[PDB]
């Protein structure tokens, strides 16, 4: 664990997708690497003997330093309860800005701990439009495959999918989508589907078939600590320091960068502060975490020479959640896997460009609800800005900016409602139909080739690199983590061969 006064060759801030890629490639190149993570390592059993808590009866392990459990669905037939808990270094951070809540994973593995495991490669044509500076041949011939393979991506057995009661909700969602002319697609995942069959057979401990996902999975889900980070640790050159929040990065005297961090206990109390010197720093604190850091450092005069583009172009991957009421003959089932495997792909339609996951609502009883999380091609963006008064970084995103996304989603769902003669639910979230006040997919803030060079370097400060979701221009049209991993793979390849 890092100590005040230490000097290290390479320091990776954060341990999500970008961080895990940076750590693996650096250590394989033989460079001793330190990861600093603000959350805890999730490899120690809790009170009940399990590492993570489930969603039906969550405890303090659920939330990052909060007083109530939380998720988008709110108090709906027993699901999504807001129970009082003690402040603890739990796994899911519902980080509130003025116009949006940004859900983020905290701990060794970052968002991989809490996400739905959906591993989607973006459409080449859209990729080529939004990231024109990137050689797409390299991406599709090499980096995307490298990412999918490293992540442990696999596909569900389609025959098993058709027969199992656990995916009845997905079959119902497929049926009504197709009746209205919409294309559906299976979605690859890092959840071990062979393990899932055994869960269904009652031969192994249930996780995905046991009400677990958003506060972690005790089995089945291949989070980064089981893949990239395990491989990085196998080199013998990785050190992970947990419960340390990086608060400041500034040029050190002579060379390198002073990195200030707050050590916290498991209740979130700062117990000590340390400053270490690093020759190279890799920002992988996430779209929000890295943007807040760099926007603060620039505003407070620590890295005053950073680009004017730092803080610009944040987006929410057009996230909109909605639920529809099925008629009684279209039940969705009392047994629902927590891992989505199917989506509605309408991205090609210029008038309603959305890719919607058919999401489970694993309440354990028949609700007749079809739930969807839509990625819409919402052009709206926002920026982070340092608030002098408060000393905090604000996000200028306004909830009204989700209106364009709702209009796009509505074009698809209104058509299905018209065909099926159904209405939307208005009770899943305060009498609101559209879940438009949160995102699971923060993207941007430090755009590739705008705030950084074409490989994620901050050119004004040699030795500083950005390798995470802050690089992505606000929207990729699909679940983001594969893109973040593949971009990180591309960047590390170049940086290691060119700079190191």
**Binding-site annotation, residues for FAD:** 17-18, 37, 111, 115-116, 118, 246, 469, 481
* Residue 20 structure tokens: 């895990």
Rounded to a whole number of angstroms, the minimum distance from the CB of residue 293 to ligand FAD is 6
Q: Which residues contact 397 (CB under 8 A, 6 or more apart)?
A: 97, 98, 99, 100, 314, 316, 382
Cα–Cα distance list, 97 to 101, 102, 333, 384 (Å):
6, 8, 36, 10
The reply to whether 441 belongs to the active site is yes
The residue among 112 and 316 lying less far from ligand FAD, judged by its C-beta, is: 112
> Given candidates 393, 458, 484, 486, which one binds ligand FAD under the rule CB under 6 A?
484
Q: Contact between 441 and ligand FAD (CB under 6 A)?
A: yes
What string marks each residue from 334 to 363 as x (binds ligand FAD by CB under 6 A) or -? ------------------------------
The reply to whether 244 belongs to the active site is no
> Given candidates 8, 11, 12, 14, which one binds ligand FAD under the rule CB under 6 A?
14
Q: Of 244, 302, 312, 441, which is the active-site residue?
A: 441
Please choose, from the candidates 481, 421, 490, 494, the residue with its C-alpha nearest in 3D space to the C-alpha of residue 113.
481
> Given candidates 53, 481, 489, 490, which one binds ligand FAD under the rule CB under 6 A?
481
The residue among 314 and 481 lying less far from ligand FAD, judged by its C-beta, is: 481
What string marks each residue from 276 to 315 as x (binds ligand FAD by CB under 6 A) or -? --------xxxx-x--------------------------
Give the dihedral sign, CA 182/185/189/193: positive
**Concatenated DSSP letters of 470-485:** GGS-S--SS-SHHHHH
Residues 69-108 that bind ligand FAD (CB under 6 A): 103-107
Half-sphere exposure (CA, 13 Å, Cβ side) for 316?
35
> Given candidates 171, 222, 245, 383, which one binds ligand FAD under the rule CB under 6 A?
245
**Concatenated DSSP letters of 194-233:** HHHHHHHTTSS--STTTT-STT--SSSB--GGGTHHHHHH
The residue among 284 and 420 lying less far from ligand FAD, judged by its C-beta, is: 284
* Residue 2 structure tokens: 């890092």
Helical H segments across 37-151, by residue range: 124-130, 136-138, 144-151
> Given candidates 164, 217, 479, 491, which one binds ligand FAD under the rule CB under 6 A?
479
Phi/psi for 10 (5° steps) reads: -145, 130
Q: Of 212, 312, 357, 489, which is the active-site residue?
A: 357
Residues 108-127 that bind ligand FAD (CB under 6 A): 110-112, 114-118
Q: Contact between 200 and ligand FAD (CB under 6 A)?
A: no
* Residue 458 structure tokens: 């901050």
Give the dihedral sign, CA 15/20/24/30: negative
At CA 384, angle to CA 383 and CA 385, rounded to 5? Answer: 115
Contact 358, 342 (CB under 8 A): yes
The residue among 343 and 353 lying less far from ligand FAD, judged by its C-beta, is: 343
Question: Mutual orientation of helices 17-28 and 481-498 as an angle, nearest 10°?
Answer: 30
Q: Contact between 37 and ligand FAD (CB under 6 A)?
A: yes
The residue among 420 and 474 lying less far from ligand FAD, judged by its C-beta, is: 474
The residue among 37 and 59 lying less far from ligand FAD, judged by its C-beta, is: 37
Helix (H, G, I), strand (E, B) or coil at 355: strand
> Given candidates 23, 66, 246, 356, which one binds ligand FAD under the rule CB under 6 A?
246
Rounded to a whole number of angstroms, the minimum distance from the CB of residue 467 to ligand FAD is 8
Rounded to a whole number of angstroms, the minimum distance from the CB of residue 31 to ligand FAD is 20
Catalytic residues: 357, 441
Residues at the interface with ligand FAD (CB under 6 A): 13-19, 36-39, 103-107, 110-112, 114-118, 214, 245-246, 284-287, 289, 440-441, 468-469, 479-481, 484
């Amino acid at each position: 664990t890092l100590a005040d006064g230490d000097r290290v060759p390479a320091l990776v801030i954060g341990s999500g997708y970008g961080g895990a890629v940076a750590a693996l490639r650096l250590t394989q190149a033989g460079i001793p690497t330190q990861i600093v993570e603000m959350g805890r390592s999730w490899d120690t059993p809790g009170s009940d003997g399990k590492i993570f808590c489930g969603m039906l009866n969550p405890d303090k392990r659920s939330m990052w330093l909060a007083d109530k459990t939380d998720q988008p669905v709110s108090n709906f037939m027993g699901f999504g309860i807001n129970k009082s808990i003690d402040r603890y270094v739990g796994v899911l951070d519902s980080e509130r800005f003025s116009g949006i809540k940004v859900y983020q994973g905290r701990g060794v593995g970052g968002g991989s701990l809490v996400n739905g495991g959906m591993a989607v490669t973006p459409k080449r044509n859209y990729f080529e439009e939004i990231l024109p500076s990137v050689d797409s041949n390299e991406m599709y011939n090499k980096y995307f495959p490298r990412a999918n393979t490293g992540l442990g991506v696999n596909n569900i057995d389609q025959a098993w999918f058709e027969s199992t009661e656990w995916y009845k909700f997905a079959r119902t969602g497929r049926k009504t989508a197709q009746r209205s002319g919409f294309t559906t697609a299976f979605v690859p995942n890092v959840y071990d589907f062979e393990y899932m069959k055994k869960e269904a057979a009652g031969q192994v401990t249930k996780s995905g078939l046991g009400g677990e996902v958003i506060y972690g999975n005790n089995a089945g889900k291949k989070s980064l600590d089981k893949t990239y980070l395990a491989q990085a640790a196998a080199t013998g050159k990785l050190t992970i320091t947990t419960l340390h929040r990086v608060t400041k990065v500034a040029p050190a005297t002579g060379s390198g960068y002073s990195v200030t961090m707050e050590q916290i206990d498991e209740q979130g109390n700062v117990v000590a502060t340390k400053v270490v010197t690093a020759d190279r720093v890799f920002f992988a604190a996430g779209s929000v975490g890295t943007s807040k850091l760099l926007v603060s450092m620039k505003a407070q005069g620590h890295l005053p020479n950073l680009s004017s583009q730092v803080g610009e172009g944040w987006g929410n991957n057009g996230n909109i959640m909605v639920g529809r009421a099925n008629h009684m003959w279209d039940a969705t089932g009392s047994k629902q896997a927590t891992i989505p495997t199917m989506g509605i792909d309408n991205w090609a339609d210029p008038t309603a460009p959305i890719f919607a996951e058919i999401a489970p609502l694993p309440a354990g009883l028949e609700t007749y609800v079809s739930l969807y999380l839509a990625i819409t091609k919402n052009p709206e963006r926002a920026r982070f800005q340092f608030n002098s008064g408060t000393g905090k970084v604000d996000l200028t995103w306004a909830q009204s900016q989700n209106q364009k996304g709702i209009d796009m989603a509505k074009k698809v769902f209104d058509k299905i409602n018209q065909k099926e003669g159904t209405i939307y639910r208005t009770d899943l979230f305060y009498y609101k139909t559209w879940g438009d006040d949160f995102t699971y997919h923060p993207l941007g803030g430090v755009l590739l080739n705008k705030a950084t060079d074409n490989f994620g370097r901050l050119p004004e400060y040699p030795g500083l690199y950005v390798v995470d979701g802050s690089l992505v221009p606000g929207n990729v049209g699909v679940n983001p983590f594969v893109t973040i991993t593949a971009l990180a793979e591309r960047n590390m390849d170049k940086i290691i061969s060119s700079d190191i």
